[PDB]
Amino acid sequence: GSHSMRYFDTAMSRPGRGEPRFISVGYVDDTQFVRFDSDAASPREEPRAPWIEQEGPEYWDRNTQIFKTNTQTDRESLRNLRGYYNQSEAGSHTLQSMYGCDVGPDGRLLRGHNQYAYDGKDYIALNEDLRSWTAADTAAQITQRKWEAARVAEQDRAYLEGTCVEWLRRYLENGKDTLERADPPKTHVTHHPISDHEATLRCWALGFYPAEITLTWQRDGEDQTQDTELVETRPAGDRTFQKWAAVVVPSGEEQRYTCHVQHEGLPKPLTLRWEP
């Protein structure tokens, strides 16, 4: 499957500093398109991608109301969770949630998602069947019991299989020039002496979209996984990403190393080496 739509919601309590803050950002792949923040002067759902701007007044009003109520729901959920864990009302806590759908090249549902984490630890998750739940502990089991009783999975499923896939398909059509375009990385190898004995060979990948990519080094055709330093893929700010991998090699043996790059915007994977 080639695409996904997903919402990343964060609710944070702050006793003595107001009601818990709620923020929700929506994405299509690695492209953000909406944001909602309860701490904004006038909280409303607002565009963060040009292709969502054409959407009408009713679209904005409806999603604004949806997130205002979700703000209340997650505040009540934070209260409940404090109870489930016998925590004091003095501490600060975080309730995160990710939900959405993945679709194939043809637009058909690959899989749905709906999970939560409390203070950075997995809490409850809708299973891939879109019918049952997996709870991480006895507190999560309380949420599971209430959800099973009210038949919540059935509501999430109707959305994840219907409405979510319909929105994703519409967004993909409206933003086809960017959402459906993969930008390949610009690549090269740099060389930095360390001493008379060793040097670093660093391999670059710049300007790529989407973020998914694989850079690896080999000495004499053998992957150097344990000896390679890799940095986390980082956003450039123009929608694209960057990344590098480095290896310290003995002076004079530079030609025994090759860097390999795989990216979806590349027809065939690349092989490069230091060119003095």
């Binding site: 999603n63 949806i66 109520t69 979700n70 729901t73 409850i124 999430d156």
Partner: peptide, 8 residues
């Protein structure tokens, strides 16, 4: 498009 969430 978003969805109505439920209380934990």
């Amino acid at each position: 498009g978003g969805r109505k969430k439920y209380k934990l």
